[PDB]
Each structure stands twice: as structure tokens, then as C-alpha cells.
Amino acid sequence: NREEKILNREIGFAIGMPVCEFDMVKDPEVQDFRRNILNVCKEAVDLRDLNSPHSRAMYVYPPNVESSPELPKHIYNKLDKGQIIVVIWVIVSPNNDKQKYTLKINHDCVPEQVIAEAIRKKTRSMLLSSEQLKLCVLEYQGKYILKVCGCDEYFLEKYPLSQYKYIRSCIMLGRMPNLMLMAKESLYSQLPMDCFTMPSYSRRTSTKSLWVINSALRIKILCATYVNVNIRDIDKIYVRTGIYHGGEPLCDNVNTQRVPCSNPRWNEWLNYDIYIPDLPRAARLCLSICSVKKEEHCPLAWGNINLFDYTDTLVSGKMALNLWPVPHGLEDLLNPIGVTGSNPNKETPCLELEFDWFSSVVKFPDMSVIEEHANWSVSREAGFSYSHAGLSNRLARDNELRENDKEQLKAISTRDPLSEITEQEKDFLWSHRHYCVTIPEILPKLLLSVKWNSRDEVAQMYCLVKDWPPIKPEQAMELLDCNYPDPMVRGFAVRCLEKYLTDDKLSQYLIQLVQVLKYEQYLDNLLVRFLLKKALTNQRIGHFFFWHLKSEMHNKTVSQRFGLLLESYCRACGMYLKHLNRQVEAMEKLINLTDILKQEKKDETQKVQMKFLVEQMRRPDFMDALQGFLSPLNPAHQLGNLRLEECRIMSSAKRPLWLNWENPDIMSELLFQNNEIIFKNGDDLRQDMLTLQIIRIMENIWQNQGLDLRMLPYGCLSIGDCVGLIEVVRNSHTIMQIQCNSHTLHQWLKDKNKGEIYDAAIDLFTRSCAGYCVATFILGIGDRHNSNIMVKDDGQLFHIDFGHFLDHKKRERVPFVLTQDFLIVISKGAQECTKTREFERFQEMCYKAYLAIRQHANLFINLFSMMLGSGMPELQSFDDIAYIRKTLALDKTEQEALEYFMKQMNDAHHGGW
Ligand SMILES: CC(C)n1nc(-c2ccc3oc(N)nc3c2)c2c(Cl)nc(N)nc21
């Protein structure tokens, strides 16, 4: 109807492409995805409608909570005998007259307990209810809700007060928590009923098993079209092919004969070393058109195909695959990690293929057929004699699992993901697979030890994975990267995340989880259904889910998958679509303005450029579009009226806009009265996004281990192709800005923190400096200098502009070299700043911080591994990630690692360590 057409227009504006473009995609996988995904949409809407209005309020305003209620000892020691002082505000009279009520209560208090105490202090005024009616009709703890003053953050669930990230932050930073008491009905009325409507597309020979096909794999290469090249630069061309399971070949590569580029017609049946029943479920045909002019081979275009379609059917008949351009840094002739499926641009090289025909629809076997076969294999193997078992190292006799074997398996499991498992160890792991069930964490290594080109082994692995004990969400995440293409394996990983991944951790790891969707074979899978359900049942997850997917819509490798996924999100997210559309339009106006300043007005004064900007922004359509919406950096932050006098074009290349909005919140003064965001169009912000995530994780590790090293992982969000937002840090200046001699910085902090507050400032400087020193050395971050190092007024040091990481200077560098300026502050003025107790203490923070990250090395290795899928230049292979194996000295021992870290610091600083 009329309502549907309007919804399609809204969805089209949000995703940046019209819905009709999907309707004309004839691929049944695309159409089946659009229809079948609506199950998740329905399920999510039903959970939100379950406890209306409360459950709808929990979707819109989910509790911003820490994963564990348990508090670290040093954070508990900041409290006054485990008690927190909280200020509770009440707006009385419509002239918004504010009334504060300071409460001293236990940190573990639940919001309703906090509301009751505030009522008691309010009742202390009309002290007639001291004894008589002391209860005050339950003291209406369920008629009110607590809100964070200055932003749209609510305390709707029964968590201990300290578990809310705001209060934990207030405790850690020694800040007074300011909460606003609000009526429940006042919040519920704001929330509309999102009555989800199903779209109009919801309304829309013989079969033989794969294993009953006694035949080797053959694939016919017919010809290519749109092969437009130089026959001066090229002598002859051929099609290179291979059969892969992830990035691992399942047999040797097969090439066609050489043909001139003038007539690319092979019509050749390529014969592969693989029995059709031994084809694993995630088996793919990887191909490329190459040129040869010793001789020099070179890929022209590449393409990957799943040998089984989304319905478990083995590919048959004729097929045409539109190829992709070679990405720079392609070492092999084939690109097996690359995207599977046809290039959406049909004006690209197009190879015509033909698969075998068996006079019937060949389907991958049912789990009952796999279980029957696995039980057959296990029982047959159990029956093998001493001599028979002797014929293979992949066959082990029972009563031949010594305490040495068990301890060797445990030692192999502790090894990092980037550690090579030798063929000897692979046979060993596989032969002892049943013992491996008792060490659940060994699963990634056992899975890499399986012969994926053997149905007998894979069928048994399937049964082991089915009854495999649960592993930690962080351990499970590794099983979703490019090394693990099997759907049974990935399904187990998703099931671990479903059971053990909290909303806090899902938000923290959302960038990785969105990335690994790209390594899925099909549009409809367990992972996407897990992510979409969570996005549609938690608006804080949904917000970033949308922006992460929207930011990569310009990439044609993921545009269809992300487009279709975004469409399903927008159809079911509810009222938030209209709020996202405000953000989308505000960003579009900013992209369009910044493009005009880079193109049209590049060669103009800042004064002149600002004159154009102010004139253009003050147009009624622009002015409205650019004010009165939610911050894409943090949607709890409302961006009110634009303070044009506070806005400015920054004197940097890319011409970033320093933007300022009023905070329209009633109690904006208690948090921040103005929201300052940097809009940058020109720079790829994905590397900074990853570094900022990692920095936050590193900080969390140190804080839990009782190491108070304060970091500053400021907000950074990529919203498109080299476009995004950066959070401004209030009251901070670069080392260059301070410099107005070596004592300049120390004197500046003395001036900013005189008297009894001086010692706290030096301590905060040293602790933050120690954290950044260790973080930057491990991650191989871009060279530090006076303009990319910043210091807050309170003494908090932090870094900006990461840009590059790891082995970017292509022999392990120290990005943050502590000049005498930093050392003088550390040593409280002392000239001999190396030979001081303050420096010795600072070194011990660096050593403890270094080793703490060494302890969590598999996490960081895994987080980087899951990000190989994104087209980041600095993160293109597992050898790039191997930089953190060097900086962390993983092969070396803990004491040898400290000696390594010390040596690097000693050489960089020219003594001291
Ligand atoms: C040059 C100066 C005005 N400045 N520049 C950035 C900045 C600008 C772009 C950035 O890009 C990245 N990745 N970090 C950045 C940091 C920045 C921040 Cl966050 N906070 C404050 N208080 N001042 C800042």
C-alpha cells in the first residue's frame, strides 16, 4: 500500500540505494534471503512487544553495563568503606527548577534502592513521615526511573549501581555521579508502538546423494568475454583454477592451455585430484585469467565459486562468472581468500564454465547420513589390529595415550594461533581427537589437523563438533575467521556466542563480527541471524550494526550482502529508522559541503572558506538537516542547535570540520553543554578504529589486573569511503601547543595543577605515559611527535592520529620515544631524570603492562585475524599480524621477553633501560 511505498523510500534513503534494485535481482538466493530472514525480524519484534512498555524501553534504552558485577580491589579502595556518594536531581515546577539530593549508599545498590533513599531525603524536608507512613506507599521505587544527567542513558534493569559503565567511570575518575529522577510514564509515552508490517515480497529432476557418485572432479572451462587488454604487453593467456577449503587447497592447481587474447576459447575439461564424495561442504572453485610473456606469469582477473549452492546442491550445467580486478599485493596467481560470487558490474571479464552432469540433482548428505558414516568409521577404527593401526600415523591404538602424550597435547593447545602446527603434530592431534574433547580449547588446532578432503575424517569431525563442549566467546571468535570455512565449525562458534557473549562484549567486538560475515559462503547463515537478532533487540548494538554495514556499502565485494542485510534491519528496527535517516542526511550534507571545499573552493583563505560554509549551512533545508539529531559517535548524545561561531574549518589537509552543537538535555550543564565533533572527509579511519578498540581492551586488561594505567580510547567512527567522525577531547592540547626548553611541559603541568593536586597530576601523567609507551611499542603505531601526542589539563597523556600499525615501516621500532620533556615531568623536575625512584617506578609500570598484554596475546592476534577481511593496506596477511608475535616475544620466555622489551627501550632512548 501507500504506507509500504513510503517505507521503501525511507529504507532506500538509509541504505543509500533504492529497494527496487533488490527486487530486480533474479538470483533466488537473494530473494530467498529477503523472504526467510523475516523470521528473525518477527522474533525480535515479539521479544520487544513481550513486556510492553518496559521491554520496548529496554530495546531503546538498554542498560550500559559492564560484563561482571565484581569490582577490582583498587577501584573498591576509591570508595568510602564500599560506599558511593551519588547526587540525585528532581525537576520540580515547569520552570525546570532543579533540586539536588546527595546520597551516601553501597556501590552494589540497585536503582530501586537508590530511588527509595532519594525519596527518604526528599521526605526528610516534610519530616512528618519520619515514623508515621515511613513506607510512603512502597516509596514509589517502581513509579520512577533513573537517568544520567546530560544524556539519554537510563537505569531500567536491576543491576548493582557500580555495574553501570557511567558509575564505574565516575568511581575510577573520582567524579560525582549526577542522576536525574524521572517518572516511568514520562519515558514510556516518548516511546512509540512500532507495529511491524511484512513486506510484499514475503507473500511470494530426481535427487541423488553426493556420496553415491563414484567419480573424480572435472570442470569445463568454455570461454571468456570482456577480455580487453594490450597484445603488445601480453604474449598469451590461460585460466588458472584450484579447489579450496578456505585458503587451503584440496588438491593441486590445474591450468588450461595457452590461447591468444584475441580469441579466449579453451573448451577444456580440467581434471582435479579429488573424489566427488570427498568434496567438503565449504569446497570452492577458485579461478583467474592469467597472462604469460624464465617466463613471467601474472593474474589479470580473478573469481571464486562455491561448488555447492545455498540449498546444498552441487553446481551443475553451464555457469558464467564475472571476474574481479587484482588487488595490489597479490602474490599468488589465485585469490582464494577473496569474495565468492559474480562481480555485480557486468562490464568486466566474464568466464563461461560448465560443471558435470549426473542426470539428477546432487545434494550434500543429511546429518543422519553423516552420523551413520562417522559411527561406521569410529567402530571400524576401534576394531583395527596393532599392525593395521601401524599403517598410518593418523590411526592410534587405545591404551596408547601415555601421560607424555596428554601433556604434549596440552602444550600444543597453549600455543598462539599464529604458531605453525607441523604435519607430525597434525597426525598426532587427529589420532588423539577423542582425548582432545577433555581439552576443549584445543579445537582450533584439531580442526586445522583434519584432512578436509577426506569424507571419513570430516564426518567424524562433524560428530565431534556436534558434542563438543563450550569454549569462551573469545576462543570461539577465532573459529569465525578465514581459517575456518566449515559451516558445522562456524555454527558451533555462533552457538558459543549465543550462549556466552554478553551485550557489552558483543558491542566491543562488533567490528570483528561484522567483518567475518564476509567470510560466510551464503547470505542466510547462523552468524547473520545472530547479529541481526541482537541488532533488532538492542538499539545500541543496532545503531553501530547499521553504521558499520553502511560504511562499506561503497564496496561492491560486500554491497549486495550488506545492502540486503541493512534492508531487513530497517524493515524491523522500528522508529529508530527515522532517527538514523536524520543522521544519514546530516552526514550527506557534511560530505557534500566538504567535497565542494576540496574541489571548488580548495584555493581559498580560511576566512573565505568559512564565509561560503556559513552561507551554505544557513540555508533552511541545510540548517535543519544539520541540527536536531543523535550523534552517530554515541546515540545517547542529542545534537541540538549548531553553534556556527564555534564551528571552524581546521588548518589541515583533508580540511576537517570542527563542529559544535548545543546539548539540548535539560541538565546539559552537569555533563557537557556543547558537543564537539570533528568531521573528516579524505582519510581512511578504519586503522584508527581498530587501534582505539585495542587500546580500550588493553586498558580493561590492565585495570582488571590491578594496574591503574588510564588510556584515552576517544570515539572514532567510519561512516563511508574515507569519511567519518572523531570525538573531541575537552581541555587537551598537543605537546607543540604547550611549547610557548625541556622543562616547558613540566612547568605547564605545575601551573595547571598547583598545590596538593600536583602529585596526582604527575601520577596521572606517568601512568598514562606508561600505558601509551607499551601500547604503541606492541602495535607498531605510526611515529610519534609533538603534534600527535596530547596532554589534558589534569595530566592525562594520550595519542591521536594512529594511521598505520604493525610492520608498516617494513628492526622492531619504538614509536613513542620519551624525550627529556616527558622524563622531567615523570621525575618531578629533577635534571638527573634517569637515575630517580619515579623513573624506576615508571619502568615497573611498563614491565607489568608489557607482560599483562603478553598474557592475552591470543585475543589480540584473533582480533587482528578477524580484520584481514577488511581492505586495510597495513593488514593484508598473517605475516603482518606476526609483528605482534615479535614485539610480544611469544617464542621467548617471560624473563627473556622483559629483557627484549628493555633492550628495545634502551636502544631507542640511547640508555636508561
Ligand atoms: C588538531 C587538534 C585540534 N586535534 N586534532 C584531533 C584529531 C584529529 C583527527 C584525528 O584522527 C585521529 N585518528 N585522531 C585524531 C585526532 C583532536 C582531538 Cl581527538 N581532540 C582534541 N582536543 N584536539 C584534537
GROMACS .gro file of C-alpha atoms and ligand atoms in nm, residues 648 650 652 656 658 678 680 683 685 688-689 692 714-716 726-734 737 787 790 798-803, ligand 1:
model
   57
  648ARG     CA    1   3.559   2.602   1.210
  650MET     CA    2   4.065   2.301   1.053
  652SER     CA    3   4.496   2.057   0.796
  656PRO     CA    4   3.824   1.862   0.852
  658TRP     CA    5   3.541   2.119   1.377
  678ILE     CA    6   3.541   1.656   1.410
  680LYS     CA    7   3.690   1.435   0.839
  683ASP     CA    8   4.128   0.994   0.550
  685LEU     CA    9   3.957   0.591   0.961
  688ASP     CA   10   4.234   0.424   1.400
  689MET     CA   11   3.907   0.250   1.478
  692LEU     CA   12   4.124   0.267   1.958
  714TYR     CA   13   3.830   0.851   2.213
  715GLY     CA   14   3.532   0.799   1.975
  716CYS     CA   15   3.613   0.741   1.610
  726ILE     CA   16   3.619   1.192   1.562
  727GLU     CA   17   3.538   1.273   1.927
  728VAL     CA   18   3.700   1.598   2.051
  729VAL     CA   19   3.884   1.563   2.385
  730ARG     CA   20   3.790   1.867   2.607
  731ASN     CA   21   4.073   2.061   2.777
  732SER     CA   22   4.355   1.895   2.580
  733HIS     CA   23   4.648   2.035   2.383
  734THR     CA   24   4.929   1.891   2.171
  737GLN     CA   25   5.069   2.387   2.165
  787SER     CA   26   5.159   1.727   1.706
  790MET     CA   27   4.832   1.537   2.352
  798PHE     CA   28   4.724   1.040   2.511
  799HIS     CA   29   4.794   0.989   2.142
  800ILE     CA   30   4.596   1.082   1.835
  801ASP     CA   31   4.628   1.001   1.463
  802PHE     CA   32   4.730   0.635   1.466
  803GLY     CA   33   4.702   0.589   1.085
  914LIG     C1   34   4.449   1.927   1.599
  914LIG     C2   35   4.364   1.928   1.727
  914LIG     C3   36   4.259   2.039   1.726
  914LIG     N1   37   4.301   1.796   1.748
  914LIG     N2   38   4.308   1.703   1.647
  914LIG     C4   39   4.244   1.595   1.690
  914LIG     C5   40   4.237   1.477   1.598
  914LIG     C6   41   4.204   1.497   1.462
  914LIG     C7   42   4.196   1.390   1.374
  914LIG     C8   43   4.223   1.264   1.425
  914LIG     O1   44   4.222   1.143   1.359
  914LIG     C9   45   4.255   1.053   1.457
  914LIG     N3   46   4.262   0.926   1.421
  914LIG     N4   47   4.276   1.105   1.576
  914LIG    C10   48   4.256   1.241   1.557
  914LIG    C11   49   4.263   1.349   1.646
  914LIG    C12   50   4.194   1.616   1.822
  914LIG    C13   51   4.122   1.560   1.931
  914LIG    CL1   52   4.063   1.398   1.915
  914LIG     N5   53   4.093   1.616   2.047
  914LIG    C14   54   4.139   1.743   2.062
  914LIG     N6   55   4.112   1.804   2.177
  914LIG     N7   56   4.208   1.813   1.970
  914LIG    C15   57   4.233   1.747   1.855
   0.00000   0.00000   0.00000
